[PDB]
Design an enzyme around this catalytic site. Structure first.
Site, short mmCIF file in Angstrom:
data_model
loop_
_atom_site.label_atom_id
_atom_site.label_comp_id
_atom_site.label_asym_id
_atom_site.label_seq_id
_atom_site.Cartn_x
_atom_site.Cartn_y
_atom_site.Cartn_z
N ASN A 13 0.80 -1.22 0.00
CA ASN A 13 0.00 0.00 0.00
C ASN A 13 0.84 1.27 0.00
OD1 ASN A 13 -1.96 -1.92 2.18
ND2 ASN A 13 -2.66 -1.31 0.14
N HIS A 70 2.53 2.41 2.44
CA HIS A 70 2.82 2.69 3.83
C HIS A 70 3.94 1.77 4.33
CE1 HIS A 70 -0.87 4.73 3.19
NE2 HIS A 70 -1.18 4.92 4.46
N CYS A 130 6.35 7.36 8.76
CA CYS A 130 7.43 7.79 7.90
C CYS A 130 7.27 7.17 6.52
CB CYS A 130 8.79 7.42 8.50
SG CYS A 130 9.11 5.64 8.56
#
Lengths: 290, 290
Positions: B183, B185, B221
């Site tokens: 994804n 992330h 992050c």
């Protein structure tokens, strides 16, 4: 006569894939090392250290010096794949372990691996010929040396020399105590993972998939050593992908991993990678012809 | 009435264990996230991105803000374990997903997990109440909220404040493009892995096994951010293990992960870990009481 190979099934997990939901080459290599280690467990059992078992190898260690993986079609997240492994005699010092990566649903062949394993003395890191009494026992589990999953003429090719410093340079990686297997040695797949960080970012971004990799394992790091990765193109069309730009051909890159201190650098791994935008999944043939 | 939980079996792999051949907490957390994601696949299918499916969630995202794992006995290399997961209603905004880590051979309970999941708006990272039309559908797969694998009084405890700089400091880790899930992330387990590098080396060396962990997930992050890990002891007996020394009690540590640039630091994850030299494997009870 059919227990001369070892097969395991695994489902590609969610954290094992790239954004295109295809398994990474790290994931493939992880599966190859897990099935190979389980082949040893099936042969010599689960010993107090894990590595083979040291039966008549009390001061001997199997070290893979060359790994070659060719990919025909990367499996995707959720796919049930089968990894079939076997090993044969390779001269009088080395053994050749090979892998078949297969899709369970279609039975097709997704990829093939081959490798070269030697026996070094643990207390001298020097090569050591296994006693012919011992080698005859290992080969009881081996198919004939005529068995090849990849064309022999396309294996065991000498890698080009590494021009230093590399054109691309991954940042200083730091070895951690986590990146150590149960034997204290750092994991082979970990060297592979560090080696591929040196690749140009525009290679994966351009839709290129790793078609083949050839790794030379030369030295070992430990504990918290500083680790540097360099990468060089091998032809001009691959050199186009270094940094930004001012029926497609394949890319070729030469990556190298080394440990550095305040004295000198020591090369750990060298890898030649072949990159293409398209591949093709193929069809196998059974080893029981033995 | 029995499909309100989801169970999967996995064999602990060789590269997933510490030198004592026991699965790491990273490996356990990896298994928890894989079975949870496969529970979503069993519920809403395998969509073009992977995360749930965005059906009436086209601009919504499930974010885990708290994870708590308690370990009773770490499985070993070669063990076939079962991970059973389910989720329940948690107020009107959150969902509570829990896990049962079980040994297939003995049926005993090896560990338990619980978590808190909220729905944030993807295009605002701001909290967003799921429509009551939508929440009623998710809860069709949920057991009653009375189901608890861990005592509720021992969950959802506020973590202590982090004194900075930490007494122990892991080196600047660098985010890589590999440490990204499908994804885009970064992976939750990756934050967990970075967080535990800040621990004193004498904790694992002393034979201490992680008994319980409580993680707060606060920020995210990306790409190649610089990542720093700090760790503090929470009582004096745990402070003994910071650096070298000049029926055992448990250790308590507070670790924190943050991303840093030339402007300011932003906290990513905070974790309280409980450490002991001995544990005890327990016995379960089935969820079909529903």
């Amino acid at each position: 006569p059919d227990k001369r190979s070892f097969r395991e099934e695994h489902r590609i997990r969610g954290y094992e894939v790239s954004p295109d939901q295809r398994a990474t080459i790290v994931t493939v290599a992880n599966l190859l090392q897990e099935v190979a280690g389980n082949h040893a467990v099936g042969m010599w059992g689960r010993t107090d250290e894990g590595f083979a078992s040291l039966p008549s190898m009390k001061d001997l260690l199997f070290v893979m010096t060359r790994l070659q993986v060719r990919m025909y079609e990367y499996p995707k997240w959720g796919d049930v794949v089968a990894v079939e492994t076997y090993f044969t005699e390779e001269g009088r010092l080395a053994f050749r372990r090979e892998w078949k990566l297969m899709d369970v649903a279609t039975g097709k062949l997704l990829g093939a691996g081959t490798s070269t394993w030697v026996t070094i003395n643990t207390a001298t890191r020097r090569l050591s010929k296994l006693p012919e009494d011992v080698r005859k026992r290992f080969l009881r589990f081996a198919p004939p040396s005529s068995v090849h999953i990849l064309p022999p003429e396309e294996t065991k090719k000498k890698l080009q020399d590494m021009e230093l410093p590399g054109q691309v340079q991954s940042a200083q990686q730091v070895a951690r105590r986590a990146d150590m297997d149960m034997n204290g040695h750092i994991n082979n797949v970990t060297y592979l993972a560090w080696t591929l960080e040196s690749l140009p970012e525009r290679v994966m971004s351009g839709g290129y998939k790793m078609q083949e990799i050839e790794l030379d394992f030369k030295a070992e790091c430990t504990a918290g050593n500083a680790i540097e990765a360099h990468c060089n193109p091998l032809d001009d069309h691959s050199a186009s992908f270094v940094g930004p730009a001012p029926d497609s051909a394949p890319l070729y890159f030469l990556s190298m991993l080394q440990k550095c201190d305040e004295n000198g650098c020591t090369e750990l791994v060298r890898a030649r990678t072949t990159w293409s935008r398209t591949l093709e999944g193929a069809k196998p043939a059974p080893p029981p012809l033995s």
